Amino acid sequence: LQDLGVANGEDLKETLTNCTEPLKAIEQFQTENGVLLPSLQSALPFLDLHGTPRLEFHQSVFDELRDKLLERVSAIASEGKAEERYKKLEDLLEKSFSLVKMPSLQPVVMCVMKHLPKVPEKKLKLVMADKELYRACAVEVKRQIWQDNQALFGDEVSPLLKQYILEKESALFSTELSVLHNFFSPSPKTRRQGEVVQRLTRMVGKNVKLYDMVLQFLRTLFLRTRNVHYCTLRAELLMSLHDLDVGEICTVDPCHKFTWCLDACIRERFVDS
Amino acid sequence: GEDDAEVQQECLHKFSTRDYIMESIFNTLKRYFQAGGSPENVIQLLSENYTAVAQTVNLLAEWLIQTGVEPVQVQETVENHLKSLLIKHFDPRKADSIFTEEGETPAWLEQMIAHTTWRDLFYKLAEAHPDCLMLNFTVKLISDAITSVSTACQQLEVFSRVLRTSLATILDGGEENLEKNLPEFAKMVCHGEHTYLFAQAMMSVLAQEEQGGSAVRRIAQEVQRFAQEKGHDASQITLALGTAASYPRACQALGAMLSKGALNPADITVLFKMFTSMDPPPVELIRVPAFLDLFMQSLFKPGARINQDHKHKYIHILAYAASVVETWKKNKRVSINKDELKSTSKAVETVHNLCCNENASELVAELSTLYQCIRFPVVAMGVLKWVDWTVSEPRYFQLQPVHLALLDEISTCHQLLHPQVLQLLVKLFETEHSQLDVMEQLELKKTLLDRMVHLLSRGYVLPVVSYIRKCLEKDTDISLIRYFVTEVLDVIAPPYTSDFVQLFLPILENDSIADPVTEFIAHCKS
């Protein structure tokens, strides 16, 4: 609260501690932290008489008004003239990041960081540093840190690459024989439906720098392991970008057309004329 | 035993529950501090779960105001939420308890009443509760700033004073504002038969004044109409009030017909024999509006039950009602004109034959005799009700509409039928069919707009443009209003009196074309 010039609980207890008139001090704190409309300072006792505390209508309007604030974050991302709308969102960011620590304004700021292509990276650094923000951050916040520095990208692709190899090893070693099916029955688009590569596509989105980053990670691990799994994950990531119709990779990558052709080749398991 | 072990927990439930510090917290705190125990941990329980929802609201509301969104949207949202919570959680017993602790509600009520939404809240609360003392007091006092009908008629003096004030407003209303001034009085009169009989007798005595008592008689007949709408028979009221007592046969006959809201060949035969006698009873005695409406719905709906030996009797009695001149020589009928009787009965006969035959093209075949015969006023009313019931059928415009042409003869040739014709077409201008698409609905609407513009040309200009303004502000799309202005400025000749401009031009502000609109606006502003 002090970040924008408002008191906290410790200031309240200071206002109560060592006071000859604690009740009037409590009332003054209540006045100084109420909702500032002139109809309320008379209606607050009246609604209090009902058995409904002041905080209850505060809770109702709290839900309503942050719903509208998130709506307007999305709107100013999509509404207003460009310089004014980005200025509004960046200013509101400076207002709101003091309360991302609080349980209210995290996802609001996460949307604001979602809709700005670049940010001062202090807040992205705090987003990676804190586990709660590391979870709740919107996808473009995570992208902006990765696009500005590869540390978190490596840190999170390493367990995901590990899980992909876990799946590959476990499926290749499974003890079922039948005339009905085998483990090579799923097509590559069938195998892209797992959340590993689809989440990796979400982590990359439509960005080419992160595409190069996953390419180099798969390159390093493929150069150390001599195993086709990382190649398969590159193909799955490229065709998952195509499943989203990601033009930022599909149209520029000379390999996209060729992998798309190879997808049908593998689907029939032949290279027809 | 001591209630400490229970009442202290009752209070501590409201202490240690999430978020109750801001409140009856004082009363329960007093019940606990007098009961002893641990009062130090009570304050800690109050402030432990203080989530600071209020300062969260400060942040959120001031951020919505930062966004450039209107704060009055927030005001409307909060008011709607709290008012809906009140209405869902209003308890009439606790309103009467607020009355019990003190007769006049403290200043919170007198501060709420300044807000229009809270005044409407008290209206919806108290219009349905005629015994809750707080609610009845609030509605009555706000009337002193609806007067509840139960407290309107609880005694003579209140009923009389509100009656005379409301009737003064009705008479001040001329011929338009009565629609708002009459129901508040009429529904007040239409609650009991004693308040009814009193108000009717007062208006009857007032009607004897030749300096406008005709209007009081009109309003009394309107209140009797409304009393019928509440399902109460005021037949014998009008009988014993008027000159029915001068003729018992006409009295019983007419009063029976009015009490049923329908005709019959028996009472009709009684009146026929009376007016066939050398002493025909007064023509004023049968000239009653609802009675003549019974004649209309007997002769012009499909059906009703009818005999030919009585068809002419109904026709001839209606002709006597619509034709005969009785001159009062100090309330003495001494000259009886019955010379314009036979032609009127002949026209009524032919027109009723056509109407109850369920005619379209055959109308155009005998439209000559029709427009010859609509010059009779009563016949014009009869054709109006017939074409109303034919055209009011759902989707009567997909199959022949010649009927709308006939109003042109009626309204043009009979001035006092201007209010009916427009008040017919207000229904027809709201025609909506899924079969006849919105294109055809707009075609019919524009046709009716041309009819209403013609009726405006006959002088019925204030209510036409007032209703056009109302339905534009409502329903009527801008295309229809533009076509209205197109036809109007194509037909109306200058000068344009400001009584017409005051409603036509400030609704024409929406458009500027039909250029005649520019000429009209320039002339009527300069």
Side-chain angles (χ1 to χ4, degrees), chain A, chain B residues 1-434 436-526:
Chain A
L1 285 305
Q2 284 73 236
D3 195 295
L4 305 180
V6 193
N8 59 349
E10 285 76 44
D11 175 79
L12 161 57
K13 303 300 180 286
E14 174 172 52
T15 307
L16 316 202
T17 297
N18 292 319
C19 185
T20 186
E21 290 149 310
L23 261 290
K24 312 201 184 72
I26 290 158
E27 273 178 347
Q28 189 59 226
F29 172 83
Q30 286 170 219
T31 293
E32 291 165 315
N33 300 266
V35 188
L36 316 176
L37 310 105
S39 77
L40 294 188
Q41 297 297 324
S42 58
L44 285 210
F46 165 66
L47 177 70
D48 273 316
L49 177 88
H50 295 169
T52 303
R54 303 163 161 192
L55 55 91
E56 192 164 302
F57 82 90
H58 294 138
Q59 160 164 356
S60 73
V61 305
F62 151 87
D63 207 330
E64 189 72 42
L65 301 158
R66 185 165 51 71
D67 289 1
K68 281 172 188 302
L69 179 56
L70 276 146
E71 288 161 45
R72 184 60 158 158
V73 159
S74 300
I76 299 175
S78 192
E79 183 173 7
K81 64 182 183 297
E83 278 288 311
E84 184 60 53
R85 87 202 181 198
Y86 299 146
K87 175 176 70 171
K88 278 179 182 288
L89 275 182
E90 288 183 41
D91 294 327
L92 170 57
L93 147 66
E94 311 325 320
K95 306 301 173 58
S96 295
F97 202 83
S98 62
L99 298 101
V100 168
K101 310 309 200 309
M102 251 183 65
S104 180
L105 268 288
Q106 169 183 237
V108 187
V109 175
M110 298 317 100
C111 291
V112 176
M113 302 295 85
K114 205 187 193 181
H115 292 291
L116 296 166
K118 294 288 143 200
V119 191
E121 282 75 11
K122 67 191 174 174
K123 295 169 285 305
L124 293 153
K125 195 263 180 187
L126 176 52
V127 161
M128 64 75 68
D130 184 15
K131 300 189 177 294
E132 170 49 37
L133 306 195
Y134 183 27
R135 176 192 152 276
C137 52
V139 77
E140 252 73 23
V141 186
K142 247 171 188 243
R143 284 211 255 289
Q144 279 165 115
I145 168 164
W146 297 324
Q147 204 176 167
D148 296 336
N149 53 284
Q150 203 175 2
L152 196 73
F153 206 58
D155 168 276
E156 195 64 49
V157 298
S158 176
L160 292 171
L161 294 169
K162 177 220 73 60
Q163 187 169 1
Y164 184 84
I165 302 311
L166 177 147
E167 289 185 356
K168 281 284 186 186
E169 296 281 17
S170 78
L172 269 167
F173 294 149
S174 279
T175 181
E176 71 94 348
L177 323 176
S178 180
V179 70
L180 297 166
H181 275 308
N182 63 336
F183 290 103
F184 285 78
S185 55
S187 64
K189 53 196 165 57
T190 314
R191 297 183 283 99
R192 278 180 281 282
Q193 287 152 216
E195 74 182 4
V196 186
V197 70
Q198 275 205 271
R199 183 57 158 113
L200 277 160
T201 316
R202 169 174 161 87
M203 306 252 300
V204 172
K206 288 184 142 61
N207 197 243
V208 194
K209 283 78 71 181
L210 312 188
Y211 164 86
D212 289 4
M213 290 166 199
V214 295
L215 280 197
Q216 178 50 58
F217 288 133
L218 297 170
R219 169 156 294 187
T220 321
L221 262 159
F222 180 52
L223 211 60
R224 88 182 82 165
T225 57
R226 257 294 302 171
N227 214 326
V228 298
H229 305 330
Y230 305 103
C231 283
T232 309
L233 189 48
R234 185 194 182 287
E236 285 180 314
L237 200 44
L238 175 51
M239 182 49 75
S240 69
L241 291 157
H242 173 249
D243 287 0
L244 287 175
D245 286 314
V246 167
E248 283 290 336
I249 303 300
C250 288
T251 202
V252 301
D253 188 9
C255 319
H256 163 253
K257 279 64 64 181
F258 308 7
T259 311
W260 166 30
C261 206
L262 173 58
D263 199 342
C265 289
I266 299 161
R267 184 61 179 75
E268 190 168 62
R269 213 146 297 288
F270 182 63
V271 196
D272 197 76
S273 171
Chain B
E2 61 184 0
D3 66 325
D4 295 333
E6 180 154 310
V7 83
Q8 296 183 156
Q9 173 48 44
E10 183 189 280
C11 303
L12 279 158
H13 185 75
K14 295 185 283 293
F15 300 166
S16 188
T17 179
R18 157 167 160 194
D19 280 306
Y20 196 85
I21 174 53
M22 304 298 278
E23 268 253 301
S24 63
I25 192 77
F26 302 160
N27 163 74
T28 53
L29 282 162
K30 283 178 278 207
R31 291 160 98 96
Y32 186 86
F33 299 154
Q34 283 175 314
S38 58
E40 294 292 308
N41 81 328
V42 159
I43 298 291
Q44 187 272 350
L45 286 166
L46 298 171
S47 305
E48 165 193 48
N49 314 118
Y50 176 82
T51 304
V53 182
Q55 195 64 50
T56 326
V57 167
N58 279 110
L59 299 147
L60 275 51
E62 78 193 343
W63 266 320
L64 280 198
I65 288 160
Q66 160 56 43
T67 47
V69 174
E70 201 192 2
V72 191
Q73 179 176 351
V74 178
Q75 286 228 54
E76 289 207 54
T77 301
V78 172
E79 288 173 30
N80 290 20
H81 274 107
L82 208 150
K83 185 178 72 172
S84 301
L85 290 165
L86 291 165
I87 298 158
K88 283 150 54 53
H89 309 131
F90 176 82
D91 194 352
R93 167 163 291 186
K94 309 296 147 58
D96 287 355
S97 88
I98 293 294
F99 200 87
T100 298
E101 64 191 41
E102 52 202 314
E104 171 262 17
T105 48
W108 48 271
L109 181 134
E110 296 187 341
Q111 204 278 326
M112 285 147 45
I113 190 66
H115 309 101
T116 183
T117 189
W118 288 79
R119 190 159 69 183
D120 216 325
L121 175 62
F122 277 128
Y123 287 147
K124 60 178 61 51
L125 284 177
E127 195 175 14
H129 289 91
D131 209 295
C132 287
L133 285 80
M134 179 175 166
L135 295 177
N136 285 250
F137 200 82
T138 48
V139 63
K140 189 67 176 180
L141 268 287
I142 293 161
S143 269
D144 264 308
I146 185 168
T147 293
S148 272
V149 178
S150 311
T151 185
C153 318
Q154 52 78 44
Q155 280 294 338
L156 171 52
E157 174 167 6
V158 166
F159 172 71
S160 70
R161 289 185 292 90
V162 184
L163 163 146
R164 64 193 266 280
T165 54
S166 294
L167 284 167
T169 72
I170 294 163
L171 297 175
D172 289 317
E175 288 194 305
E176 174 163 1
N177 267 330
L178 61 101
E179 187 182 10
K180 298 182 294 304
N181 292 122
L182 179 52
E184 61 185 358
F185 161 78
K187 286 174 289 202
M188 145 167 74
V189 182
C190 289
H191 193 277
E193 204 150 40
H194 45 91
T195 186
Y196 186 73
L197 170 55
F198 164 60
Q200 296 313 109
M202 289 297 104
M203 291 181 286
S204 85
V205 173
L206 291 157
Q208 304 190 45
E209 279 190 350
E210 286 191 347
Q211 57 267 39
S214 95
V216 179
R217 182 178 167 195
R218 159 57 166 277
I219 295 157
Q221 290 163 322
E222 296 273 24
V223 177
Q224 175 162 121
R225 158 231 56 188
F226 212 79
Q228 266 292 125
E229 293 170 51
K230 314 307 273 183
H232 308 121
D233 280 314
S235 301
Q236 325 91 234
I237 302 295
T238 314
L239 297 182
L241 195 61
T243 56
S246 74
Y247 287 96
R249 312 274 67 74
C251 178
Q252 78 199 8
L254 180 56
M257 292 208 262
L258 303 176
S259 70
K260 307 163 205 196
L263 304 173
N264 44 358
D267 299 330
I268 289 284
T269 292
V270 167
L271 301 188
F272 187 88
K273 293 175 71 174
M274 284 181 94
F275 303 137
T276 318
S277 68
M278 276 304 324
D279 176 77
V283 70
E284 59 171 35
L285 191 48
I286 71 198
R287 280 166 175 178
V288 173
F291 188 42
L292 305 161
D293 165 67
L294 307 181
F295 282 90
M296 294 315 86
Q297 61 224 33
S298 51
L299 293 154
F300 295 99
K301 190 170 176 176
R305 52 186 190 157
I306 191 69
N307 313 283
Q308 315 314 304
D309 292 324
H310 303 104
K311 188 167 165 177
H312 74 105
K313 292 185 182 296
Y314 283 63
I315 289 158
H316 169 261
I317 291 166
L318 187 60
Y320 169 85
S323 71
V324 158
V325 184
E326 296 186 1
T327 321
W328 299 120
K329 237 198 175 186
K330 308 172 283 187
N331 316 127
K332 301 309 303 174
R333 167 196 72 209
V334 302
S335 56
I336 300 90
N337 184 14
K338 52 144 67 176
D339 306 329
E340 63 186 352
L341 180 69
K342 201 215 172 184
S343 60
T344 310
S345 65
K346 202 162 67 185
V348 172
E349 181 181 357
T350 54
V351 162
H352 158 53
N353 298 136
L354 295 170
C355 290
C356 261
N357 191 22
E358 304 189 29
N359 306 137
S361 59
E362 54 261 53
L363 160 54
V364 182
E366 301 297 332
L367 178 54
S368 76
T369 318
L370 190 96
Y371 282 6
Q372 167 50 42
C373 287
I374 291 178
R375 180 56 262 175
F376 291 97
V378 61
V379 183
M381 318 308 260
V383 179
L384 174 51
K385 308 316 162 283
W386 173 64
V387 302
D388 186 13
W389 294 313
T390 63
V391 178
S392 67
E393 185 194 65
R395 302 193 174 90
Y396 195 75
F397 309 96
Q398 59 177 29
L399 68 167
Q400 191 174 227
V402 56
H403 296 57
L404 276 165
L406 313 185
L407 301 165
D408 307 358
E409 170 57 15
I410 288 169
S411 60
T412 315
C413 299
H414 314 289
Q415 56 177 90
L416 185 46
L417 314 191
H418 298 167
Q420 285 77 353
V421 165
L422 187 69
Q423 200 165 12
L424 164 64
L425 301 189
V426 297
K427 97 195 267 185
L428 298 191
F429 187 46
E430 300 180 41
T431 39
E432 286 173 321
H433 326 105
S434 287
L436 295 187
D437 59 350
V438 181
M439 186 63 265
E440 179 54 29
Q441 297 159 41
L442 285 175
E443 275 186 39
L444 179 72
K445 283 168 203 161
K446 287 174 176 66
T447 309
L448 300 152
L449 286 192
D450 270 307
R451 300 309 91 85
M452 287 189 281
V453 166
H454 162 73
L455 173 131
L456 186 151
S457 89
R458 313 312 314 182
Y460 204 89
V461 62
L462 281 77
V464 162
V465 189
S466 81
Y467 172 55
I468 288 290
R469 178 161 213 164
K470 190 171 186 180
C471 72
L472 174 49
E473 290 170 318
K474 226 160 171 187
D475 287 15
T476 306
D477 60 349
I478 292 162
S479 81
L480 276 163
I481 305 296
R482 188 179 289 163
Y483 185 80
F484 199 97
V485 175
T486 300
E487 299 295 318
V488 167
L489 308 182
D490 186 55
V491 302
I492 66 166
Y496 307 129
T497 58
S498 175
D499 303 331
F500 157 76
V501 177
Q502 67 192 17
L503 309 191
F504 191 93
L505 169 153
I507 66 185
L508 178 52
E509 68 187 357
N510 63 339
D511 303 327
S512 186
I513 52 170
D515 185 290
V517 168
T518 62
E519 179 178 35
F520 175 82
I521 295 161
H523 174 85
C524 297
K525 198 178 184 189
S526 64

